[PDB]
Amino acid sequence: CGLVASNLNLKPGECLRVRGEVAPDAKSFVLNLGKDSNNLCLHFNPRFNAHGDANTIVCNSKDGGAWGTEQREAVFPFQPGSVAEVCITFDQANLTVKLPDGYEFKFPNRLNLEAINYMAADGDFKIKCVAFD
Amino acid sequence: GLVASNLNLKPGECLRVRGEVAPDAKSFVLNLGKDSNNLCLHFNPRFNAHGDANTIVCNSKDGGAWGTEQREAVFPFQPGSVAEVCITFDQANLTVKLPDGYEFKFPNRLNLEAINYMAADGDFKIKCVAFD
Numbered sequence: 001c002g003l004v005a006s007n008l009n010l011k012p013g014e015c016l017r018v019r020g021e022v023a024p025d026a027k028s029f030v031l032n033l034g035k036d037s038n039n040l041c042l043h044f045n046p047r048f049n050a051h052g053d054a055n056t057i058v059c060n061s062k063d064g065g066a067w068g069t070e071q072r073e074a075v076f077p078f079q080p081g082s083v084a085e086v087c088i089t090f091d092q093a094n095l096t097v098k099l100p101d102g103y104e105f106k107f108p109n110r111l112n113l114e115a116i117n118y119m120a121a122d123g124d125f126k127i128k129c130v131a132f133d
Numbered sequence: 134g135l136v137a138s139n140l141n142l143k144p145g146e147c148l149r150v151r152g153e154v155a156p157d158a159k160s161f162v163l164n165l166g167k168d169s170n171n172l173c174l175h176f177n178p179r180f181n182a183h184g185d186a187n188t189i190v191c192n193s194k195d196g197g198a199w200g201t202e203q204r205e206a207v208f209p210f211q212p213g214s215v216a217e218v219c220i221t222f223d224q225a226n227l228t229v230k231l232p233d234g235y236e237f238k239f240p241n242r243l244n245l246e247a248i249n250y251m252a253a254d255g256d257f258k259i260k261c262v263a264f265d
């Protein structure tokens with residue numbers, strides 16, 4: 001397991017910037033956001049080739065230790081052996097993951113927490129920089 | 134304040150922390166090590182705290198026990214402004230680079246093969262954390 005950050009006081013509107021390195025042999029990587037490891041309002045999992053998925057982003061929530069229903073997208077703006085930057089924010093309705101080029105993924109806010117307190121990276125993704133602004 | 138785990142910061146690698154020092158700051162803390170009980174560096178600039186003023190306080194914590202405290206004479210921090218600190222370590226010392234060109238060494242007393250844990254506290258709002 002990779003970088004774990006807690007006591008982030010990320011309130012609605014505030015923006016979490018993460019820059020990291022995608023491994024050359026990347027099958028998938030994971031960015032987890034929420035209250036703690038059992039309460040995730042966003043499980044952001046780009047799968048190059050993993051768990052039956054190829055070049056597909058799988059988003060989900062985890063509520064009280066229980067996974068929710070997976071949501072899949074068409075576009076896949078990630079490539080192995082490269083640098084990936086995401087800007088993440090949320091409001092009462094959705095979590096939004098923005099990519100520099102203009103890509104924008106919305107995931108429904110299923111947990112409705114006051115803040116994002118927890119971030120964890122996993123899989124083939126080496127976090128290089130985290131910024132709160 | 135912010136807590137980071139599984140940093141896996143190896144010797145020679147550099148940890149960059151940028152933050153916002155409160156206008157009425159009394160003190161803030163950067164803790165580095167294995168966990169809250171095992172700190173190879175307790176970095177504690179004191180503006181107006183524990184009877185001290187404009188003093189950089191450093192110490193270690195080994196198995197819950199504070200080590201022998203040390204202090205630097207300079208103080209390149211100024212409340213109500215942005216401050217950046219860069220930390221690295223070898224087997225002998227931790228090297229802390231301060232904003233205004235200043236740099237000092239704190240003896241490596243914990244014999245860890247990596248820094249895996251960081252905790253911020255006090256009047257210091259972290260804005261950026263970088264690893265390389």
Ligand SMILES: CO[C@@H]1O[C@H](C(=O)O)[C@@H](O[C@@H]2O[C@H](CO)[C@H](O)[C@H](O)[C@H]2O)[C@H](O)[C@H]1NC(C)=O
Pocket residue numbers: 043045051052053058060067070
């Ligand atoms: C059988 O379908 C597959 O089920 C697995 C599973 O372990 O249940 C799914 O993989 C997990 O997905 C969650 C998020 O929902 C998380 O990413 C875990 O790390 C995965 O192990 C998988 O999505 C699913 N595959 C399909 C239906 O394509």
Ligand SMILES: CO[C@@H]1O[C@H](C(=O)O)[C@@H](O[C@@H]2O[C@H](CO)[C@H](O)[C@H](O)[C@H]2O)[C@H](O)[C@H]1NC(C)=O
Pocket residue numbers: 175177183190191192199202
């Ligand atoms: C006179 O000794 C003083 O003891 C206090 C104490 O509470 O034990 C010291 O304050 C602590 O310092 C450690 C690091 O050394 C850490 O910062 C704690 O948060 C503080 O409570 C104080 O530094 C010390 N004064 C001296 C030795 O000048």
